[PDB]
Symmetry: D3
Subunit: 150 residues, 6 copies
C-alpha cells in the first residue's frame, strides 16, 4: 500500500550544520509525502524510549546526551515502501562506509554524528511515529499523485 | 540586533509542489537559524487572524479559503535583519516580476499562487509568530554559526 | 491568459558547453510547460529568417554563420507572461552585465556567445515559433501543475 | 569505440514531474554527447514496436497505453560504453531498490512510474534509435572532446 | 581584452563555513579561468598591505586581525571584464542588501563577515595579484574554451 | 584518529572541464577539512616520483605526460578515515563502472581521463603529501568541529 509511513529525524548535528532543507528536499524529490513535521529539543525520556533497543550498549549514555543536546527536526513521510527506501537514501550506520549519493555518505564522517535517523522497520516506524507525534499533528488527507503511482 | 525573528510560511501551493526543503535550505545557507518549524492545516480562525488586515477587502475570503485548503509548513527564522532579508530573498508579490535568484523569481508564475509568505515587518513578525506558534515550540537557546557575526 | 507561448533556443555555444539540461530545468522549475523541443543544426535560410530584422546591419552575417555552425536546441514554453519572464530569466544582452541568478549572469562572459535566445515579445514569439516548429511538433493538450495558477 | 549510442526516453511521468532538464543535465555532465532530441506524443504502433520484447506479457498493454498517454522526451546520447553507463545512471527496474545518486533512486517510488527508459544493449539501442528517430534528426558531426577521451 | 585578471579571496569565515568549492565553482561555471590558487594564513604585513586604503580607519585593525585569524583561499581568475563581473557576482558590501543569486546575497548576513574579497578595479587587481602571488604561481598559458569568446 | 590526511589531485582533465569547485565542495560538505591547496603545472620530476610505483610498467610514460600536460589542483584533506573515504567518493578506476553519486561516476567516461587522483592508503598519502606540498603550505592545528566528531 502507498500509505506506509516512516519516522525520520535530522539529529542535532544535522540541524546545527544547516542540512534540514537539503534532507527534506531529497525526500520530496523522491516522491514521498510529508505528513508530519516539527522542530523540538528531545527530552531525556523521549531519547531513551526512542533508542530503547540500545540501552544496553556502552555508547547509550552519550547517544541520549547528544540527541537531547540541541534541536531535532522530526518528520513523517508517506509512500510505498518508504521505510526501507528512506533507509537506502540514508546509507548505513557508519557514514564513512555510506556510499556517495546517500545522506550519510555525502555529509558524515563519524558514527556518533551521523546526521539523521530513519525507522528500520514498519513496526519500529509505527512505534516511533506514535512516540514523537500526536495524532492531530499528522495529515489524514494525502491524495495519491497519479504521476508517482500506477 | 542579531536576534530579530521573522515568520515564514510555505503556503499550500508551495508544499504541494515540493518546495519545502528548497526554501528551508535557502534560509539555512544564508545563515539564519530555525527557531520554530511545523506542518499544519490552518484552521479558519487562524487564517482569518493571519489576514485580519484584509478582512474588509474583497479578496479576503479567497486568501482564507486557500491557506486552509491544504498543508502549510510554518517556520520562524532568527538572525540580523532577517525580516527584511527574508522578503528580499522571496522577491516581490508578483513572481513574474521577481528576479531570477529569488524564490518567486525561480519558482512562481502567478501572484495568486506565490508559494510563500514572509512577515512584512518586525511588528507583523512578532504578531504572526505568537499567532502561529506556542512559546514551547520556539527555541530559547539559539546561537548561530560562530563565523556569521562579527 | 496562461496560454501565452515563447520561443527559446540554446545556441551553438550553450549546447557545446553542456547547458541544455540546466536551462530546460530552470524553465520547468519556474512552472512553464514545454510544448515543443528538438535539436537541429539550423539551415542558412532558417537563420536568415530568424534574424531577418537585422538583415541590413553589418553583424547580420556573423549571427547567421554562428547559429548555423553547430547543433541548437530549440524549444517552446507555455505559461502566464512566459515571454517577458523568459527574458528576465535569461538576463541582458551582455552576460557580463547580467545579474547572478540569470542564465547569462551565471554562465556567460561574451555578448557574441550569449548562450541562449528568447523572443522579445508575443508577436516575435508567434513568428519565431511558426518559423522553427511545424504545428504537429507542438502540444495541443497542456494541463500544467494545478498549483501554479489561481 | 566512443561512437557508441543509446536511446533514452523520459516517459510521460518524468515529463509531467518536470524532470526533463535534470535528466538531460546528468548525461551532459557525465560527458556523453546529445546527438538526437525531441518531444513527441508516441503513437500506438511506435510504442508496440518499442516494447516488442513484452508483446506476450499481460503488462504489455499498460506499458503501451502509458507511454502513449502524454508527451515524451526522446533522446540519443553518444559516447564510450554509453549504453551500459546510461542504465547504471538510471538505476534498476524498481526505483525503490535503486541506490541514491541514480535517477530512479533519487526521484522514483514505483515500478509502473519509473520515469525513464534506456536501451538495455547495443543491439536494442540501434533498434530503438532507428524506431524513434529519422536519420536527419541525428548529428553526424560529433567531434570527441580531448578532455573526455584519451 | 579577455586577458584581464582579478584577485579573489575566500576570507576566514568563508573557508570556515565550507564555501570554498561553491565559490570556485561559480566562477568556473561563468567561464573565467583559474590562473592562481592557494590556501594560506595571511601574515600581518600582508593583511596591512592588502588593506592599505583603510590604513587610517577605526575598522582597519579589525580587518587585519580577522583576515589573519585563519586560513584564506587566495585565487586569481582571468577573462573578459572579470574584475567588474566578479564584483557583480559577489554582491555588495552589506550581504543583507545583496540580491539573491549573488555570493553574499545567498550566504552572508553580516558586513563584518561578508565571506569573500574581490578586486574593485584593474588597478587594484594588478596590485593585489602581485602582493599575494609570486610570478611562478600564475599560469602563463591560458587559451580558454572557444565557446566562450567570439 | 581524526587527524588522518590524504592527497587529492584534480588532474588536467578535471581542471580543464571546470570541475575544481564541484570536487572541493564535495569534500567540504562531507566534513573533511582542507589543510593544503594550490594550483600548479607539475614538473616531470614530480610526476615520475608521484607515479614511482609504475616506473617499469608500459603505461608509466602516458600517466607522466598527461599529469604534466596542464594545470593541476593539488590538495590535502584531513579527517577520520579520510583516505579510504575519499576513494569511495571518487568511485573506481573506470569511470564507466563508477556508481552515480561518485565523482567519476557522475563526470567521467574514460579511464584515461578519470578526473582525479586520491591516495590509496595512509602510507601513500603521507608519501604524496610530502611530495606535492612543503610543510609550510599545510595547516598545523585544526581542532575537531564539535558537529562532525564525538
Ligand atoms: N559504535 C557506536 N558508537 C557510538 N554511537 C553509535 C555506535 N553505533 C551506533 N551508534 C549510534 O546509534 C544510532 C542507532 O544505531 C542503529 O542501529 C540505527 P542506525 O545507525 O542504522 O540508523 C546510530 O544512528 C548512531 O548514532
Amino acid at each position: 500500500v502507498n500509505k506506509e509511513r516512516t519516522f525520520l529525524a535530522v539529529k542535532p548535528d544535522g540541524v546545527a550544520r544547516g542540512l534540514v532543507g537539503e534532507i527534506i528536499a531529497r525526500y520530496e524529490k523522491k516522491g514521498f509525502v510529508l505528513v508530519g513535521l516539527k522542530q523540538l529539543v528531545p527530552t531525556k525520556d523521549l531519547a531513551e524510549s526512542h533508542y530503547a533497543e540500545h540501552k544496553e550498549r556502552p555508547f547509550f549514555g552519550g547517544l541520549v546526551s547528544f540527541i537531547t543536546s540541541g534541536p531535532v527536526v522530526a518528520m513523517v513521510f508517506e509512500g510505498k515502501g518508504v521505510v526501507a527506501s528512506a533507509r537506502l537514501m540514508i546509507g548505513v550506520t557508519n557514514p564513512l562506509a555510506s556510499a556517495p549519493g546517500s545522506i550519510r555518505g555525502d555529509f558524515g564522517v563519524d558514527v556518533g554524528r551521523n546526521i539523521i535517523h530513519g525507522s528500520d522497520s514498519v513496526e519500529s516506524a509505527n512505534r516511533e511515529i506514535a512516540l514523537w507525534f500526536k495524532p492531530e499533528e499528522l495529515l489524514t488527507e494525502v491524495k495519491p499523485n497519479p504521476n508517482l503511482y500506477e
